[PDB]
């Protein structure tokens, strides 16, 4: 999308994969705020917002929290408390066309500075003089939007940068968006410290004949202690028994 018509998509009710974005590293700009880009995005979120818009290279810093500029105050304003990722990359082959591509617009002037995460699709002729615009293109009345005009042979500062702003809310208790997960291979018939869904315990894991209900993760027998647990990766139910101990 163009910057003025900033398109928003909602990443909801799915396990998120940020490692694939990290290992690819195909994004020249990788600035994450609140959550660090150094493998800290493997976390749980109630709401993940993805927003895409194509800007010129030279003002891709402007769209950072507490920064000011034309794009910042008239097209897309980032909240000063942004706890997300501003990811940017060159799209010169894809988004520059011979003779220029004029499909991407930007609001050079507007009556007032834009509020956080607020859109303006209005085409009302900007006022710059005492004479009313009346919806005509003339002196002291100018169309608010302009074409970037990316050209194939141009500086990267004058070449398009696709930006996919990711807005995280950092709530780990509610957490619709499941985070990326590590993988640890199953080990059986050994006294092992197991951490199943945050539950830490000591004991051996063995094959379990118990049939858990689909909505049940771990089981508790009489006297309220864990007896059988279903691992979430491969939905396998394993019986937990304490490893051997006794007096001497």
């Amino acid at each position, epitope marked *: 999308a163009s910057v003025y018509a900033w398109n928003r998509k909602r990443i909801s009710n799915c396990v998120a994969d940020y490692s694939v974005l990290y290992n690819s590293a195909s994004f020249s700009t990788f600035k994450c705020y609140g959550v660090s880009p150094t493998k800290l995005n493997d976390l749980c979120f109630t709401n993940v917002y993805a927003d895409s818009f194509v800007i010129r290279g030279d003002e891709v810093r402007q769209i950072a929290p507490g920064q000011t500029g034309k794009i910042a105050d008239y097209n897309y304003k980032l909240p000063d408390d942004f706890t997300g990722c501003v990811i940017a990359w060159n799209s010169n082959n894809l988004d520059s066309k011979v003779g220029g591509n004029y499909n991407y617009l930007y609001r050079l002037f507007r009556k007032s500075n834009l509020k956080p995460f607020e859109r303006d699709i209005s*085409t009302e002729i900007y006022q710059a003089g005492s*004479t009313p615009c009346n*919806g005509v*293109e*003339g002196f*002291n*009345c100018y169309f608010p939007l302009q*074409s970037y005009g990316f050209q194939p042979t141009n500086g990267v500062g004058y070449q398009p940068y696709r930006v996919v702003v990711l807005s995280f809310e950092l709530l780990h208790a509610p957490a619709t968006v499941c985070g990326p997960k590590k993988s640890t291979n199953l080990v059986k018939n050994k006294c092992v410290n197991f951490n199943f869904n945050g539950l830490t315990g000591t004991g051996v894991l063995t094959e379990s004949n118990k049939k858990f209900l689909p909505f049940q993760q771990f089981g508790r027998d009489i006297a309220d202690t864990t007896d059988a647990v279903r691992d979430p990766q491969t939905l396998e139910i394993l019986d937990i028994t304490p490893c051997s101990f006794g007096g001497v």
Partner: antibody, heavy 122, light 106 residues
Framework: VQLVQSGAEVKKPGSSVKVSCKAS????????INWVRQAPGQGLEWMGR????????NYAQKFQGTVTFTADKSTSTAYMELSSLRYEDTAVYYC????????????????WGQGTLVTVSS | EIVLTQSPGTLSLSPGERATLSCRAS???????LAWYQQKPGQAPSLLIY???SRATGIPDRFSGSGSGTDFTLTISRLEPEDFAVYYC?????????FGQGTKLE
């Protein structure tokens, strides 16, 4: 670069007509289209403009309510609809370019179509 | 809305050398938002001079405008036998792009 328009309309008085100025490739992208009424033997009367990309059409006070401007984003063709043929409405309707963007700040008419003359008959 | 009054109404008497084709407006043209045109007989007008003195693509350098404020000149080095087309003024200063009456009408 080329804005070939419609020819001549055999429209009996009171009968509506639609014009067909044809924009070349990339015309609509960065340029608005303007229509000017040229009644045979007078001066040029600016009717209004069509901003094709955003579908914005604004008309002068004189022609408001009497003429309709439409443009087709696909096929890149400019259209003008006349509500009915009033007796004084007979004129050669032209179509012309404009650098409507602020940075260009043109707003003048670069290139023009051949013209579409409406009349009581031929 | 700003009106325009072309003063030399009829200069199609096959003249020569420099001309003084004029236009004047009730309220002064702002920022040289004027456009000269070239309406050849039987054909559509072609842009002649935009701004105040700027040159158009294809147009000879001979055509020029020495105007300011109430922009009023279309100096031409030499009246060509073919170049007797009625020249039209226009103002785009936040108005409904009104045109003048014409200056070389037979």
């Amino acid at each position: 670069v080329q804005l070939v328009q419609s020819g001549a309309e055999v429209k009996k008085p009171g009968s509506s007509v639609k014009v067909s100025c044809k924009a070349s490739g990339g015309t609509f992208n960065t340029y608005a289209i303007n229509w000017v009424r040229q009644a045979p033997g007078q001066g040029l009367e600016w009717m209004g403009r069509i901003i094709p990309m955003f579908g914005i059409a604004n008309y002068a006070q004189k022609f408001q309510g009497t003429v309709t401007f439409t443009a087709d984003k696909s096929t890149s063709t400019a259209y003008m609809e006349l509500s009915s043929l009033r007796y004084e409405d007979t004129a050669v309707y032209y179509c012309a370019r404009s650098a409507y963007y602020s940075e260009s700040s043109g707003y003048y008419l670069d290139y023009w179509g051949q013209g579409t003359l409406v009349t009581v008959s031929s | 809305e700003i009106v325009l009054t072309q003063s030399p109404g009829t200069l199609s008497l096959s003249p020569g050398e420099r001309a003084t084709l004029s236009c004047r407006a009730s309220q002064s043209v702002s920022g040289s938002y004027l456009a000269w045109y070239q309406q050849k007989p039987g054909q559509a007008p072609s842009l002649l001079i935009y701004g105040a003195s700027s040159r158009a693509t294809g147009i000879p350098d001979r055509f020029s405008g020495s105007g300011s404020g109430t922009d009023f000149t279309l100096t031409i080095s030499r009246l060509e036998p073919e170049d007797f087309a009625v020249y039209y003024c226009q103002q785009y200063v936040n108005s409904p792009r009104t045109f003048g009456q014409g200056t070389k009408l037979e």
